[PDB]
TrEMBL record, chain A:
Sumoylated with SUMO1 and SUMO2. Sumoylation of viral proteins seems to have a positive role on viral replication. It comes from Rotavirus A (strain RVA/Monkey/United States/RRV/1975/G3P5B[3]) (RV-A). The chain holds residues 741 to 789 of 887 of the full protein. The N-terminus binds RNA. It is necessary for encapsidation of VP1 and VP3. The N-termini of 10 VP2 molecules form a cylindrical hub underneath each 5-fold axis of the inner capsid. It comes from the Viruses. Belongs to the rotavirus VP2 family. Homodecamer; each decamer is made up of two conformers of VP2, called VP2A and VP2B. Interacts with a VP1-VP3 complex. Interacts with the intermediate capsid protein VP6. Interacts with NSP5. Interacts (via N-terminus) with NSP2. This is Inner capsid protein VP2. It is found in: Virion. Inner capsid protein that self-assembles to form an icosahedral capsid with a T=2 symmetry, which consists of 120 copies of VP2, with channels at each of its five-fold vertices. This capsid constitutes the innermost concentric layer of the viral mature particle. It encapsidates the polymerase VP1, the capping enzyme VP3 and the genomic dsRNA, thereby defining the core.
Length: 49, 396, 397, 396, 396
């Protein structure tokens, strides 16, 4: 839960999961970029954020 | 093992300490340990079972960390924690059961189940913390080749053996001289019987000797000695050595004479007790030598004088008893005893899931066969399963 | 219960850890727990004891908190803490005694004394902390109806019973076939005696059977089985079932034949042991069936042959024994055992203050009466008083 | 004693908790306590041994502190800690042994070895921390003059004594009335025998009494009372009181009548049970009075009537037996029991190093002599050595 | 179970309350609960099982919420609600049927079907609301370790049993003294019969005793006690205990004498009624002891005096009878009774789908065999299935 993560300030679990490439779902109202470029997908930029 | 023990101890501490209303300062270190366990376990897949009727179970960890409060835990916190705790306890029980039902002639001390083998990886060493129980402490010491110690109340050190030796006999079994004994668990009951009451024996003394070779060295042993053997003081009909015939025993009990208990280690006398009854201490031994004597009483009242004629037939056979009871001892190896449940737990788990007989332990985990042939490989496997059984007992 | 246990646990930790010269970092968490206890209890009146000879005691709490500025504990700090601890220990002793001498038919698991009832309120739940003792742990598991477990060395699972059954008998009592048993505590001694030595039996086999029904299920039970029964192996003069006359028993012991131990649960075989002596494991059972045969030995030396004639009179009666000792077991209900003191403590408190007989327990806490009729209401009351007795034993003992 | 215990407890906690991979949060308080122990002990010289064959050993403490900055403990940290732990464990073991082998008459509670007396100095109290064990807790209560309590499973309260008293006797020992008993450990078997089966007794009833005095008061005692004495239910030939002759005993067992067990404190009846067998509770007592009766069966079958004639000779002797087994009790004094090991440890150390007999304890630490003459001075010395033995058992 | 009950209660309320023309305020809370149920169930797949002939069924939830903004419900609203209600009712009925046909020995109180285990997940706890029925209230109280009781009109506490005991008998069966009894359901009919009419009995009184040990404790029991047993008041030809022959019973009914009905708990008398007939109250008991006496009438008119001769042959056999009917009672455990349909519902569902016999219940859910061996595992399974049957009864 992104709201809980913002409130606690404790980023240990999220940091450990991101460092170790552990599949996860971040839940919360998020702004998103609409990318229409195939090259952006081939560059795998959605994984860089 | 240390890691499995640490998981189990963390879960036990969480169950005991994460209680509604408690100060967060009571649980802070425990919460940190628990969250570290969650971090280390999350994302790892485990498989338990697939032996006998133990079902195959798959374990996945995708849990959140336990939160923090200002002052005291509330009911919400406890329920949230208890969900995670319950899943972890299920997992640990299943891992322990998977390890308890497996054995190996080679490397019987090493983990045998897949989940414990995975738990021995470096990544899980973070979980490891206070290893304070007797079994885990001895496990760590034995890994380091340091002197181990297990304290047993009434150790099951003697395999069951109800036998007799005849030193003087003949096909009619009417003038018999010999010894009969029960070695069972932590008790020795021996009795030397002379049918002639040592009428012809030199000095009117018949010497009886019994030797029990303990399969492991006992130390710091409290032993009760009692003059009589209540098990061999009533009349009985006993099979012949080859079973061909039965003979008759009609004990009349006399005080054992020149009682001498020797506790020996590697063939050397360590402790000696002459005509001492009650509590004695055997500090370090692997052999018990009980020497006693039937001394014909030089004076007899007419009732007594009648029972022991100069010659056959002998109807009242003079028996001298001896009872030895190891109340508590210390052994460098693991043993069954009257106060623990490790053997019973392992046997229960093996019987409940119909574990087929393996190449290490006797069928049914029968203690008599196991202790009779207590090989080092058996000792390693049995220490492993006993440690796992204790780890399981922390939670189940 | 959890609050009373937490009070006692805090007091015991304070007695063990608030010691002269110790690093404050050794006791910081304990100091916080002790201060939380003091804060919660301050300003509360309690009354304990208005039953039997237990006196009415009134308890008032107005204590200062222990300091937190020291780096090491000095003598004065320890003495002031000890003063507070002594008052609290006296109070907890009295609350435990007051709860132990009371029973209820309806909610025997619930508190009965007024002080523990007050301690059940929400304001006191702050005191609650580490519940690690086996009895309080089982208590919390039982509250949530999770699988409990009590480990008993030599459980007192058998009520005392010394009796005999006669299958063949007649008024002279000289050709008797039957069984005699002592079931006491954790031990079953049984013996089948045939006076004719199965001379006229069908193939010279006399089958004996003994059924013991436990009032609670036992799990993970280590049991010693020894072939002989020393209790029924010497001459005896025994009353008749009606008590009119007395008969004679002159036994001669033969090894029992085809010994079969059966451990059963709900009338279903769980463990079977055949010709196995020494240590055995009964994993889960509520009934023991011991079946064993007297086999007339086909070949006898002249003394043995003289013992057992072809017909009456029979002077030497063929007896086969069995001894069964539960060394350790696990039960989901509380039980008296050889190592603990819960029953003895409850009985001692009840006798010390002349607690009148109540509607739950036997006329004086006799364990035979209790275990014979171990009903659920009795189980609830007994678990309550035993948990209280353990809490008291943490401090008083 | 509290300082020695705290040293041992710190060392045991360090052994169990300073392990590879553990969070520093798990050990931070322990690390502070350990460093405080190093600081307090540094620059201090000790000498142990010099009694019997216990070798003189010199101890010097100049150690570095453990680090505090790690997030998780690594192998280097554990080895660094383990070197110091090994030296300290050796020192504590030697101090415990040096104290266990010494005794004093006037002030036997106080420390006897020079090292422990030095450790009783004020400056060493900084080491002192959690005193949670039963023996150290009772030690601190006794030092504060509070009520003490030791739980014993099968307390060894009764010194070994197998004796008989004849209330009716003749030189031919054929019409004998009396009783025989074994008191041993936590067991009391008694048996009253009438050779005439109370034919000439006023109401055909023979009353038997047995008083046993416990050398210490027992409280909260769970006892099992059984109506037969297997120890005195088989035929035996028994010496005479002077030892000049031997008499014959041919028991036939009748159930005891009007069984009355009284548990007394200072001659006052605390507990009383009539015709009650199985488990009974003696709440507080120092004496056990067993009264039972042989009641001649008014109606007999022909075999029973043949056993007991009107006049002599008497070949079948009527016997009624009682068995009293203390399974658990509480005593304000230290006692040997079946589950603990303090007595065995003290005796083992006194034997391995050939400690000369001192002016307090009987030779060889024999328990029967100690408990028969359990004087206050002996109790003080025994509590000291038992506390030391427990502290030693924490590490060795 | 609480969630399944909440689903059923929501559906029952929706059926009863969502009706044309009704004010929305009458149903507003119910509509909120219904929408909460829809939200919690949406997006979840369920499978109700294929055990026996019960077909495998798959359930999907993608329902919209019911409106909230009308002043009065209209026909469109009712039709829209009914569409969703029908599906939810079908799903709940299938879950109840799947749970009713399953049993477990280790944990019979826990849910057995996959759907009910899924519904016990925390994600469904939002559905839970008013638990007001007796069975669900008992369920919650029992999960809370709280004293709760089921009220039974004519509880079926007695296993069916029609038997007799002959205390005096002979191969010709013509001078018989004994008892005949039927224990059936909530009814006991007992009768003591003496053929000699106590002509040769001490004081001319024959005593009869009948003990019925209830398998569960009953409380606040209203009982009718009538002084005769019409079941054993007419001529009968009765098999013998082995069935080898048939004997003849020719009752003549006399008033039972010294009628004493005891209701006992743990062997102690709780209630006692002497010569009282009509309504009595047994407040708390597990056993019923009926003592009664056939008293020979001291004076007899010639017609009466003929029926009872001084010796055989005896043609008119004097019988005294009692009848005990439990009208109402309370039990901790669940029981069949004359009013409730839980047993009938469970048995019907098990019969319709050819559910094999499991390891818990007897074949066919036969109540006599079930109540005879009412084990704790049977009790747990039976309370579970009875609660599920009541929940199903709310809708089906
Ligand atoms: Cl024991
Ligand atoms: Zn032979
Ligand atoms: Zn024991
Ligand atoms: Zn008889
Ligand atoms: Zn004499
Ligand atoms: Zn018949």
């Amino acid at each position: 839960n992104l709201e809980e993560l913002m409130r606690t300030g404790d980023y240990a679990q999220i940091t450990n999961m991101l460092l170790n490439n552990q599949p996860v779902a971040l839940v919360g109202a998020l702004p998103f970029i609409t990318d229409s470029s195939v090259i952006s997908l081939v560059a795998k930029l959605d994984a860089t954020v | 093992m240390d890691v499995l023990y640490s998981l189990s101890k963390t879960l036990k501490d969480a169950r005991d300490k994460i209680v509604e209303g408690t100060l967060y300062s009571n649980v802070s270190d425990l919460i940190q340990q628990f969250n570290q366990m969650i971090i280390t376990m999350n994302g790892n897949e485990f498989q338990t079972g697939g032996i006998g009727n133990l079902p195959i179970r798959n374990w996945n960890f995708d849990f959140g960390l336990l939160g923090t409060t200002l002052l005291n835990l509330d009911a919400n916190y406890v329920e949230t924690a208890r969900n995670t705790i319950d899943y972890f306890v299920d997992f640990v029980d299943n891992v322990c059961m998977d390890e308890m039902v497996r054995e190996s002639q080679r490397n019987g001390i090493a983990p045998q189940s897949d989940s414990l083998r995975k738990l021995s990886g470096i990544k899980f060493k973070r979980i490891n913390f206070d290893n304070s129980s007797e079994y885990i402490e001895n496990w760590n010491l034995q890994n380091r080749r340091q002197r181990t110690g297990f304290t047993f109340h009434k150790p099951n050190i003697f395999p069951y053996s109800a036998s007799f030796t005849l030193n003087r006999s003949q096909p009619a079994h009417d003038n018999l001289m010999g010894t009969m004994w029960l070695n069972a668990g932590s008790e020795i009951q021996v009795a030397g019987f002379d049918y002639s009451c040592a009428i012809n024996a030199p000095a009117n003394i018949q010497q009886f000797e019994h030797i029990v070779q303990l399969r492991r060295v006992l130390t710091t042993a409290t032993i009760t000695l009692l003059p009589d053997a209540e098990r061999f003081s009533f009349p009985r009909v006993i099979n012949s050595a080859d079973g061909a015939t039965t003979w008759y025993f009609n004990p009349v009990i006399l005080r054992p004479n020149n009682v001498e208990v020797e506790f020996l280690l590697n063939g050397q006398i360590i402790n000696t007790y002459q005509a001492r009854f009650g509590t004695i201490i055997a500090r370090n031994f692997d052999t018990i030598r009980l020497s006693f004597q039937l001394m014909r009483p030089p004076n007899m009242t007419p009732a007594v004088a009648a029972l022991f004629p100069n010659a056959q037939p002998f109807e009242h056979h003079a028996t001298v008893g001896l009872t030895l009871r190891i109340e508590s001892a210390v052994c460098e190896s693991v043993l069954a005893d009257a106060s623990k449940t490790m053997l019973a737990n392992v046997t229960s788990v093996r019987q409940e899931y119909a574990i087929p007989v393996g190449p290490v332990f006797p069928p049914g985990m029968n203690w008599t066969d196991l202790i009779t042939n207590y090989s080092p490989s058996r000792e390693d496997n049995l220490q492993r399963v006993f440690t796992v059984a204790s780890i399981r007992s922390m939670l189940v």
